Each structure stands twice: as C-alpha cells, then as structure tokens.
Structure to design on (270 residues):
C-alpha cells in the first residue's frame, strides 16, 4: 500500500490519532474523524487540531458532540472527499486517479495561500519601516 | 504513480521499447507488444528479448509477423494478465490490488525458479569436477 497514497485509507487515518483525547461516549471518536477524512496533527498548542487529508482544511475547537462530517462540510464545503460515497477498494482507478490529482491541487492551494500570507506579512512589515523614515 | 506499479500502464510499457526493430508493417510493433504485456528488457547478448511485466516470462526470437499476444498465450498460459480484458482505469482498486498481489507472487516464483537453475548449474560444475578427479 504505497505509503504516499495511504491517507485514502480510513484505518490509516485512524492510526494517525496519537492520544486523541475524545473516545467512547463522544460523537467525534477518532473513527468518526477518520471517517470524515481527518488526520491528527498534534502540536504544542491545540493538540486537538486535525486536518482533512484531501482538502487540507485544519480544524480545532473540537467538542465531544461535534459531528466531524458536519464540521467538514461547514468549514470546507468545497472538499471533494466529502462527496466520495463508495469505499476505497470500490473506486475505479480512473476515479481514484482523478481524486489524487485533485488532492495534489488542493495541496498547492494550501501552500500558495500560505506563501501569499507570509508575503503580505513581510510586505506590511517593510512599508511600516519605510513609513518610519518619513518621520 | 508509484514506480513499482508503473508497468501496469500500457503507455509506460510502450515507452520501454527503445530501438525496437519491428515498426510499421509488423505484427509485433511496440504497440502490440505492450498491449500483450511485454516490456523491452534488452541486453548486449539478447537485444531481442521482452518480458511480461506480470508473469515474467521472457521471450526472444522475435520476427516481424509475430503476434505478441499469441506468443504470450503460447509460452505462458498461466499468466493472469492474459485474462485481464478491462482497460486499466476501469479496474477497481480492489481488483487492481489483487493483481499486483499475484504479480508479486509471480516475481518470487521467478526468483526461486532462477535460484534453482543457478544451483543445478553449479552442481554440474561440481559433479564434473569430481568425476575428473576419479581418473
Ligand atoms: Zn476536505
Ligand atoms: Zn505475462
């Protein structure tokens, strides 16, 4: 199972949850999260944050009665994965190759938006410095 | 796509035949050879030979009116690709994964069959060595 293309695997998605806080008795059990495409991205801050393997929308603020499907459609209506209804081994390689192609795109988008924000930041920072020489 | 799984792609197989002699007017064009599962694995000592990427039978002695499917069905009936009638992107990732399972099998078979042939070889050298030491 080619490790680069593994996140299409719900069990792999489940395995990503290292010490995911919410378990039985909760509605966003990590199964329900992986079922929604999310994977665990624990950090120093917000160790509750997960990311959709396909659209890459990141999401925290998780409470036990949050429906990870409902939060995925809400914060990332454009996610193509949400539309996948068949199981993985049930996709034709035509469909699957279209997904991984779209997903790689979604990944460039995340990177592009990110470089752009990092740029505007250093942009804002330099004009402030220049403005200060007017004074 | 994962380079180990690239020979499943007809176009990839076609791309293999570099300096293949038989071209227009021939029955074993690199088109027909690839459609038949062959891949060009030429050597200095056998620049004619192609190998089925799936069952691993290798075949030289190619003449321009050879139909590589009929030469395939001939020398390796047990090859599972021959029964693959669907196009590639129409397989379910389930069936596709089943094939590569069998193909990995076929490669191990070839490995042992080869390890065995190497052994009977060095046996012969050892038997003939001993016999000469009788005289
Ligand atoms: Zn998504
Ligand atoms: Zn074959």
């Amino acid at each position: 199972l080619p490790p680069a293309w593994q996140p299409f695997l719900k069990d792999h998605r489940i395995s990503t949850f290292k010490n995911w806080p919410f378990l039985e008795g909760c509605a966003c059990t990590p199964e329900r999260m992986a079922e929604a495409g999310f994977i665990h991205c624990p950090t120093e801050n917000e160790p509750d944050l997960a990311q959709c393997f396909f659209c890459f929308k990141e999401l925290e603020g998780w409470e036990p009665d949050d429906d990870p499907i409902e939060e995925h459609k809400k914060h990332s209506s454009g996610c193509a994965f949400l539309s996948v209804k068949k199981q993985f081994e049930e996709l034709t390689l035509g469909e699957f190759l279209k997904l991984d192609r779209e997903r790689a795109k979604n990944k460039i988008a995340k990177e592009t938006n990110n470089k752009k924000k990092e740029f505007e930041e250093t942009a804002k920072k330099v004009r402030r410095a220049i403005e200060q020489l007017a004074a």
The pocket of zinc ion (ligand 2) is lined by residues B 37, 52, 54-55, 57, 72, 76, 79, 81 (CB under 6 Å). Chain B has one domain: 1-135. The first helix of chain B runs from residue 10 to 14. The domain at 1-135 of chain B is CATH 1.10.1170.10 (Inhibitor Of Apoptosis Protein (2mihbC-IAP-1); Chain A).
